[PDB]
Each structure stands twice: as structure tokens, then as C-alpha cells.
């Protein structure tokens, strides 16, 4: 997970990501297949 790569699969900065809920984040992680 390169910063443009995370930006690229989450459509979202890692900062952005760290402001959704943690239900949120492993939601989007298990979506992109991101264990």
C-alpha cells in the first residue's frame, strides 16, 4: 500500500481513511482484499 495506491483503491488519503469509523476501515480493507 503505496500512498498513491491507497489513495487509488480507497478513493480517499490515508488521513481520510483514518477519519472514517473503524467498522468503516476494515470494511474497505476486506472490500479491497487488504488483509
Known amino acids: ?3 498513491e495506491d491507497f489513495k487509488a ?4 488519503t490515508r488521513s481520510a ?3 472514517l469509523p473503524l467498522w ?5 480493507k ?3 482484499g487488504l488483509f
Open 30 to 32: 476486506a472490500e479491497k
Open 17 to 19: 481513511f483514518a477519519n
Open 9 to 12: 483503491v480507497f478513493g480517499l
Open 1 to 3: 500500500l503505496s500512498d
Open 24 to 28: 468503516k476501515q476494515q470494511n474497505l
